[PDB]
């Protein structure tokens, strides 16, 4: 049984705050073939190496992917402190991880472009006292608490989204603001890989 990466190659990759997760156990993978379909602009890892991530056996392999503009490379890093890692997407600090920035070649036709890149520039809660603010920093392997009030793609840079919470949900307010980056001629993407060592049935082919 081969690990099935093909959902990645068909359709429009979501924006970073809606990153799509594929999880793999008990299967065989070929990461070097998958990456051969893209033009890889950056490939950096933490507690592992690009050579190792393609060659080892794991008890679990998780691959996150999304549209992402190369111009925001500095905001997609295990060292970053900007809106992406604070509010949109954050990897595990304990398991080995890699981050890959890539471009869809004209070769690759089954991946479709959204109208622009979008990200959450801030998600925050105002508590029921109407005076205490709690910025909603995203947890590793989780989505922002604002994904339900932010559209699939932000229409205009600076749009606001606001939701009053019922008392059963804590009361107060949940507010997000969205930012956009103009689409590029070729779609640019981000990939996040997280591996775990356990019984290690995720092995290279």
């Amino acid at each position, epitope marked *: 049984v081969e690990c099935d990466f093909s959902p990645l190659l068909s359709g429009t990759p979501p924006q970073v705050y809606n990153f799509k997760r594929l999880v793999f156990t008990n299967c065989n993978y070929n990461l070097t073939k998958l990456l051969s379909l893209f033009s890889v602009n950056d490939f950096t890892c933490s507690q592992i190496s690009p050579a190792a991530i393609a060659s080892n056996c794991y008890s679990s392999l998780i691959l996150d992917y999304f549209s992402y503009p190369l111009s925001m490379k500095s905001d997609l890093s295990v060292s970053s402190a900007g809106p992406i890692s*604070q*509010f949109n997407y954050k990897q595990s600090f304990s398991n080995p991880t890699c981050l890959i920035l890539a471009t869809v070649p004209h070769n690759l036709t089954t991946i479709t472009k959204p109208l622009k890149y979008s990200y959450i520039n*801030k998600c*925050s809660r*105002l508590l029921s*006292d*109407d*005076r*205490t*603010e*709690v*910025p909603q*920093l995203v947890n590793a392997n989780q989505y922002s608490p604002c994904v339900s009030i932010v559209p699939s793609t932000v229409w205009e840079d600076g749009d*606001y989204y*606001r939701k009053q919470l019922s008392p059963l949900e804590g009361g107060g*307010w949940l*507010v997000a*603001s969205g930012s956009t980056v103009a689409m590029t001629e070729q779609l640019q993407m981000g990939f996040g890989i997280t591996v775990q060592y356990g019984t290690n049935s995720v092995c290279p082919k």
Partner: antibody, heavy 129, light 109 residues
Framework: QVQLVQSGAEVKRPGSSVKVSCKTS????????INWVRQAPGQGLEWMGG????????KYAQKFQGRVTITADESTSTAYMELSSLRSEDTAVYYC??????????????????????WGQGTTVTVSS | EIVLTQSPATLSLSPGERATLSCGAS???????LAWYQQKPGLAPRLLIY???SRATGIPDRFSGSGSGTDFTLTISRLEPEDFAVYYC?????????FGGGTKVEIKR
């Protein structure tokens, strides 16, 4: 360099309403809450309420609840206080003042309606027949 | 409401002397959320001290604040001529924000 500039003096009859504006310049809103504080002749200072720009949600002292509306327009960087059913005892100088800005809680939470480091010049409102 | 009581109502002192201003709260002021302001006739208040003991930007060293719970103090170590004015304490530990009634520091002659 940040300045708060309020609209000019007002004279109002009892029962009417007044709307005072407060424009921030020399800097961003930067999610500093705007407070409204008034001072009647010869008296001390009274907090009426404020608004937090990021949320667009205002908070009011209970003694003014139902009577005051505080709003904010990010596109013009202007906040507004509207006080209704005016009485002669509402005659006062009305100040807008900004919370002291602090490092972002992204601490782990952030308290709005604080010590106030930048104040408007004040707007005199006289309520009389 | 947290009631803030300032004392004395009037301090009468000479340039160069030490001024000690007190503010008492009717209940505990959470997180030491207490500020001090100066106000001169016709002008808006000016923040001196916040969080009980931190000096605001640009405020000279002769101003300091201390205290916690329900007792707070503003001290001016050596008065300059421009320090004669009214001083207000303000708490923001609880809603609504409240101010003390003020202490006037006037020139004794």
């Amino acid at each position: 360099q940040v300045q708060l500039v309020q609209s000019g003096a007002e004279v109002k009859r009892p029962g009417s309403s007044v709307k005072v504006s407060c424009k921030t310049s020399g800097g961003t809103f930067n999610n500093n809450a705007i407070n409204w504080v008034r001072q009647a002749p010869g008296q001390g200072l009274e907090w009426m309420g404020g608004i937090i720009p990021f949320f667009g949600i205002a908070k009011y002292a209970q003694k003014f609840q139902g009577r005051v509306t505080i709003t904010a327009d990010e596109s013009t960087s202007t906040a507004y206080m509207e006080l209704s059913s005016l009485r002669s005892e509402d005659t006062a100088v009305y100040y807008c003042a900004r919370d002291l800005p602090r490092e972002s809680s992204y601490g782990s939470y952030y308290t709005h309606y604080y010590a106030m480091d930048v104040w408007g010049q004040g707007t005199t409102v006289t309520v009389s027949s | 409401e947290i009631v803030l009581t300032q004392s004395p109502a009037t301090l009468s002192l000479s340039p160069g002397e030490r001024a000690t201003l007190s503010c008492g709260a009717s209940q505990s002021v959470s997180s030491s959320y207490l500020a001090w302001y100066q106000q001169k006739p016709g002008l808006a208040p000016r923040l001196l001290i916040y969080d009980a003991s931190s000096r605001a930007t640009g405020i000279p060293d002769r101003f300091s604040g201390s205290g916690s719970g329900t007792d707070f103090t503003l001290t001016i170590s050596r008065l300059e001529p421009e320090d004669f004015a009214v001083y207000y304490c303000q708490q923001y530990g609880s809603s609504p924000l409240t101010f003390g009634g003020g202490t006037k520091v006037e020139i004794k002659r």
